[PDB]
Nucleic acid binder design. Sequence first.
DNA 1: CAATATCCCGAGTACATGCACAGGATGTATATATCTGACACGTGCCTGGAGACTAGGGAGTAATCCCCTTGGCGGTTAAAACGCGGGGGACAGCGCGTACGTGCGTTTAAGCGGTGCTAGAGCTGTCTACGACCAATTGAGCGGCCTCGGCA
DNA 2: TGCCGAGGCCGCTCAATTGGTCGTAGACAGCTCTAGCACCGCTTAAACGCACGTACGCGCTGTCCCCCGCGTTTTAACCGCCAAGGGGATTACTCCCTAGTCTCCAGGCACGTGTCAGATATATACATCCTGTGCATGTACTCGGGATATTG
Lengths: 97, 91, 81, 79, 94, 92, 106, 108
Amino acid sequence: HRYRPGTVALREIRRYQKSTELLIRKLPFQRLVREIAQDFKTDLRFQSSAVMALQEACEAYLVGLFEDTNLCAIHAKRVTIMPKDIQLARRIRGERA
Amino acid sequence: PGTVALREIRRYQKSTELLIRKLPFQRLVREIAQDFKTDLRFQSSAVMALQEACEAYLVGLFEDTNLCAIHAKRVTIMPKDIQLARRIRGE
Amino acid sequence: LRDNIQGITKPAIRRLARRGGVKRISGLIYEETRGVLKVFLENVIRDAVTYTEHAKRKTVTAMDVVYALKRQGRTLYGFGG
Amino acid sequence: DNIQGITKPAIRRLARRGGVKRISGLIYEETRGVLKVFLENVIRDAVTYTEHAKRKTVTAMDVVYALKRQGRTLYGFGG
Amino acid sequence: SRKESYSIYVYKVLKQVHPDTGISSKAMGIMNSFVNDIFERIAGEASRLAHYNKRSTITSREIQTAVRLLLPGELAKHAVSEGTKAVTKYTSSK
Amino acid sequence: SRKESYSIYVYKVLKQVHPDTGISSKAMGIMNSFVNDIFERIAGEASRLAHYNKRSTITSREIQTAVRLLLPGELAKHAVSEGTKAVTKYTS
Amino acid sequence: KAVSRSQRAGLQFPVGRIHRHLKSRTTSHGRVGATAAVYSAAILEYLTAEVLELAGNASKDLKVKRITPRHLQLAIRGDEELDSLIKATIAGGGVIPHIHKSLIGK
Amino acid sequence: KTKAVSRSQRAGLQFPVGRIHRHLKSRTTSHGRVGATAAVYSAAILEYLTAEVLELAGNASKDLKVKRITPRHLQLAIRGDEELDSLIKATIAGGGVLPHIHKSLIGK
DNA sequence: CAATATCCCGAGTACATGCACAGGATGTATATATCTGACACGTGCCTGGAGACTAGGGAGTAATCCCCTTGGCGGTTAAAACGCGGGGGACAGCGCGTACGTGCGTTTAAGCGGTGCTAGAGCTGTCTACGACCAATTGAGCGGCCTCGGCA
DNA sequence: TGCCGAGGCCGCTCAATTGGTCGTAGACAGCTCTAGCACCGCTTAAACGCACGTACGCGCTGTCCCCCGCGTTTTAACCGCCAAGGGGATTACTCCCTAGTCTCCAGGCACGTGTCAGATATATACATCCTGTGCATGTACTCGGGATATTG
């Protein structure tokens, strides 16, 4: 027994679109915000709840960018997302060009 | 063939005139305000300041709409492109 | 007033389109674009009339429409403010 | 490098919440680009509000005010 | 040291509209923040109608105009009614 | 009664950088709008900065921060390097 | 015996803590007393639309105590609102389910 | 009584330090506008009217005309990479548009 | 039809609510004060309306070929599942910084007195820029010269 | 052998762009306002900012063990190209409506000044609404076992 390609992708939508939990691991994202910070002011410290408000804002941005990206792929007859889709969505919202 | 339509682009991207007829646009703005209050009077510069902002919105939307038609491998713009450009923009 | 949105005549929409950099315009763009322009006018002239009503004026003035635009992220330079 | 710890399956989860079925293998290294620039733009402001007040730890209020400035408000941590 | 929040008033309103119900400590953070945000929009925007007309004093008729710029659709038509009732009760007792 | 505008200082600054050149009246209204838009954005951000830190005054630093938020790039480090000339000369 | 101005308006929210708040956002000039009674009751009245529309949610899930996966799953579902709060993410709130009609099996 | 020397000339600036101080006080500000903070603000206003006029006459020259009509703003304010970020919100009335045909719509 | 999966129901419980309590700091009262702005009243700009004319533009039609769309294809690049690997997530001690208190004194505001920076003028009065006309050049296709390949 | 049609090179001449020269009409820039209202200088009292001290919260850093991410590889269905078929988007043209200009004529009402009372600020005294704290017990959770739903 083995499902059809497609079956498990739609199973995952109905899962991660019902939970509200955080999707990136804590420590790997905590390392990233420190490295981006020390380029602007050396020997910072972060409050434990500051990095959470970064993460909860990032995930909510990424998830919104994908939701607006899929709209492009669907319009362009595909179902697969590809870089050329993100570059369109992100240009109409005025972020990058 | 297909060249005179392209010759118009090079014309209207050089001139900075207003492109909608003035009186027809002015009478539309008087119509749309009546359902907010009866018997406004419009200052002659207010009607101009609407037109200058409208044309600059419409032409920004056609710039952002064309990008969608290119994405679908087309040339021709279609309402489904305007709809996309407004939905993704957040109107 | 009668039906004055029809006064945004088809050629004028083509001029706006031509400025924006588009080659070929399907015949359904005309009736869609009037729909977009009428929705924009409503949402700005409503604010402009509320700025007017606050000041007890009857005449709508250029600063009222400029303040109306300024709050929607659509600032206009050219008429002051 | 620390940005590669935004692992491939994590991008898939984020994408799955957003509703996409099938993901080109080019989207992983491209998406990291948009996350890396987004963090860059709010940490500049958060460290600016920090340096203003002479303290040298970034607080939750600093990242709240940075996010508020750029039109990406969050209710959660202190409005 | 001590901090002021709308934490008690939202609970007091909750018990007016769903008597059996309560609200999490994680959810209070949100409500308190929504209340701050709408307050700061109304108060911050009300200053500008005072500049545009060159008036000194913030006044009911001014706030009434702020909560028909900042509120959409039918939501505005209800808030404008509700606040008018509140003023009419206050000014009948002083 | 008098109406007041920045129209003369933009003209004075034009003759600083292009001594032959001029402005049409319609193209003056643009500068006379732009220059007061950037006034308001600095005043508004400097005001909030004082409030967040529960100060009453607005010293130089309450503005240098508002410029270092509000300007996008090289313009921030230039404008900060330009304004610190002005106050350094003034305080002599 | 002191009264409270909240009772004269008929409001649950603090009419005199507002007023003192507005008096700190005010150019260099004062604020009419009849502003606090139309400032409040146009902040209450969003509560009893933000809370209140959770009738359609908390009670429907057979669970007591409003929590952050609600408000979301409502404030971004009713649509006279939404416009008031577009500018805000809800922490720990997730998103409403969808799936677009071309991704589901045909 | 030793004449007067305007705060502009003391600072080294062509923008009006006095006028701006009286504008900042009675803006939506808190109750104490220090005088050194109207000099670090005439400066970081005049600096744009250099950095944005400098390049604009820089293009009126190229079209071989003396007086800077309105489109010559647009062709800088929405062409320099930093100005395009500072002025996102601005429509320049009668300013026209920056000319461009999409590279895929030209034939051959 | 078989199988993996989601759905559903009851047990046992580590913890977060919703309450009661002490008490403190700010909302409220009672009285005095002054200046903002509501109300009345002109003067004057200009928003509006109706006429006539010229001519730019829009409307409607006819012919056509450019494009959009559907179908069928050969291939690579993803999804699924398994097996294996490393690194996230759960645990006490130091001392560095945010936070609060006390104090000095830098500096802004408020009143007053004097005059020059600045803004409504004139119809200024030139002199840029706007139409209006002109000449060169490139570009392309068609109508005239000369050698050769396939056919009698 | 031969024959003689098909094929490969040079000027005419119409149509875009580009750069060039003329001339008549507003709209910039320069004075003179000059009258005038704000910036400036000189007193002063006082609010608030800046800078020590030091108390103790909480952010950084070292220790152990599981989920999760990494690596494989088969194969399936999707992205991709391409070729063909229809009609709808364009083009060119004639007839037509009405935008644009100038012109006269009225009267709404924007605009600014003059009065004076209604309104809110500020003080002092004071009492009761809210904050921080410590507390029992009910809700919402995590788990295990079986029923229903749905995929292949």
